[PDB]
Structure 1
């Protein structure tokens, strides 16, 4: 919830990099809550009141004390309003569907009542189509200025990624941001694990004329470096630190500095320029020859800044 509220607060579109140069417009927020507790609802209402967004938002609130079968209408009404606003009034809407796990639990309740053929853990065999009818109501239309973005939030049961709810969602959605219990226990906010996280539409939104040209390669190199660092960390937990080669020791230091300066940022709003600066600073910890995912030109342009960022 904290991450969703922070994204809603800080979400901006940066026309200056794109090249249109026209003044931005703010996001309308449609917020659909299913089976939400009073604690979480209080958090969200207070955040929106604090940031003034409660005037440019629509709230559908199915609480955990409200009827269960009504939980199936909530996202559909929310998305009807979102599409109306976006594709008839040229708005840019941001939909937040909190606890889609509750939606799937309600769907299972109904399916079990009707004695339909189940799927994997009692969930109805059509759960995939039902979730698609909600998720595929996002996008952008040709000849229309408005848009609908969705950020569903679902709690993975028993942290299990192969559970039917996360599994089917990941087959429908365009990537996912997966939080790490380990990072959270280390005190990291926002605790976003990069390796199980993906965005499938990133390439159509970064590079020349959008952001700056080294974005994609920097991200690829960060992924490679962090994967190697995690592998070396697994090795160290068996065969001790002292046995590491110097290159592996470098990868370890990179993994730690990554987790402590890139992932951990608290409640700060970082522009894409500052994030890329921090990224190149972390990448400068490695020998310039081990950056195989980045072309020579970018390494020349940006390599060599220390972690002196303040």
Structure 2
């Protein structure tokens, strides 16, 4: 196909440049900007009119001039070339290999913004995932097709939790009989503004596990241009959707530090002087975040599935910050790490009370896992809440004024926090986690367990702690 070039630049300021006679540039097209030194920059058309067209640049504008710069069209819609040979490769976040191998041969070209799934075409996610963490498996269980972010802190070890989850996740078909074999997950890893220290840890963990041979990595380091941070998750989700819904793979998507994505969006929104929001963020952040989150799930009539574990850091541990607030309105739950638990050496420091999973209620019950799952979970939540309240009361009055029942609740809380949450690198099964949960519930009298029916009580009761 023939190429066309426009040389009528009129105005350059910051990330934006104006092209005068560009009447036939489609809205949303991708252009290539070349200066007198031969360097090539990318850009996207963001406003087209009769008088001119407005183009934002994917990186800095140093070196451009109005006399020798020319803008050439590439494609009308931003597209990515996908293929089955991309498993085991590394990319720079704009589709170029970093590993030094030759580029792939595309099978299809797909738009990076994707298309919305028809709600009629979806189906309910139902397959329970055993991750090996008791605070997740029992009380915040994960289902194939769920988006479940991790609410990290400034210095909390969320990366280790994500690596451990990716290392141990399995579907356990024997508890349901709906299949066999050991069909493993494919992993798509997207990093936005990551530094060398965490990138090294992730790379060594992936090579030690051996799962790097079936994973695709999109890496945008912290010194890369900031506008590339916008495009990075979209291509990763495009690859995940293509693999899952055209080759029956079960993929798992990990997005690292989407707080960097939110500041990247805020920078462009401030440059485009659009109307801000609660803390200077643009007013359309909800829609942009929804165009990323809502690309997961399962589809009726197809075997594939997409699962997302985003990672984000709460600024100053403030849960009312706009980024965690808008994340909580879209995703199907959250996992929140506690700094107080991390201070006393508990690993993983998952906080049970603010954590939540909305798809628990169709992934566990009769015919999958066990029938006492939900009642045990509810009783554990209620008892832990009472224990926390009593412990807060003790810090004011003192232990000397405590009723013996409140003493039992406090001992239950201090045993729960010490034995259930704290597990290290141990790979606990679901049955072992339920055994530990029933062992902790025996510290209370049978009259307290109002959340559990009398059918299960007696069938499991009175066991002591056997994990040493």
Q: TM-score range by the shorter chain?
A: over 0.9
What secondary structure does 1:149 align onto? strand
1:242 deviates by: 1.3
Q: Deviations over 1:48-71 (max 9, x none)?
A: 111001011110001111111110
SS of residue in 2 equivalent to 1:193: coil
SS across alignment from 1:308: coil
Q: Is the 8 A contact 1:32 1:78 kept in 2?
A: yes
Alignment of 1:83-232 (within 5 A): 83-232=241-390
Question: How far did 1:24 drift?
Answer: 2.9
* 3-state DSSP of counterpart to 1:211: coil
State whether structure 2 residue 452 is matched by structure 1 residue 297.
Answer: no
Deviation of residue 90 (structure 1)?
Answer: 0.4
Q: Specify which structure has the higher proportion of strand.
A: 2
Query: Take 2:225 and 2:301, find their aligned partners in 1: how far apart are those partners?
Result: 40
Shift of 1:212: 0.6
**How many residues were matched structurally?**
310
Unaligned runs of 5+ in 2: 1-158
Tell me which residue corresponds to 1:234.
Answer: 392
Deviation at residue 302 of structure 1 after TM alignment = 1.0
Name structure 1 gaps, 5 residues minimum: none
- 2: CA distance between counterparts of 1:52 and 1:176? 28
Query: Taking structure 2 as the reference length, what is the TM-score of the superposition?
Result: 0.66
Map 1:251-262; keep pairs closer than 5 Å.
251-262=409-420
Taking only aligned residues, the RMSD between alpha carbons, in angstroms, comes to 0.7
Select 1:273's aligned residue among 397, 412, 431. Answer: 431
How far residue 19 of structure 1 moved from its aligned partner, in angstroms, is 2.0
Give the drift of 1:304: 1.2
Cα distance in 2 for partners of 1:16, 1:99 equals 36
Aligned partners of 2:386 and 2:407: how far apart in 1? 11
- Describe the superposition over 1:218-251 as per-residue Cα deviations: whole angstroms up to 9, x where unpaired: 1111000000000001100000011111111111
The structure whose residues are more often helix, as a share, is: 1
Measure the CA separation in 1 of the matches of 2:306 and 2:253. Answer: 7
**Cα drift, residue 303 of structure 1:** 1.2
Structure 1 residue 205, shift from structure 2 partner: 0.4
Are the counterparts in 2 of residues 35 and 102 from structure 1 also a CA contact under 8 Å?
Answer: yes
> 3-state SS of the aligned residue for 1:286?
coil
Contact 1:19 1:209 in 2 (8 A): no
* Secondary structure at 1:166 match in 2: helix
TM-score by length of 1: 0.99
CA shift for structure 1 position 309: 2.6
3-state SS, counterpart of residue 88 of structure 1: helix
Higher Cα radius of gyration:
2
Distance 2:253 2:176 in 1: 24
Do 1:34 and 1:62's aligned partners in 2 also have CA atoms closer than 8 Å? Answer: yes
Q: CA deviation at 1:20?
A: 1.4
User: What is the CA distance between 1:308 and its match in structure 2?
Assistant: 1.9
Q: Aligned to 1:29, which of 172, 187, 194?
A: 187
Take 2:205 and 2:243, find their aligned partners in 1: how far apart are those partners?
23
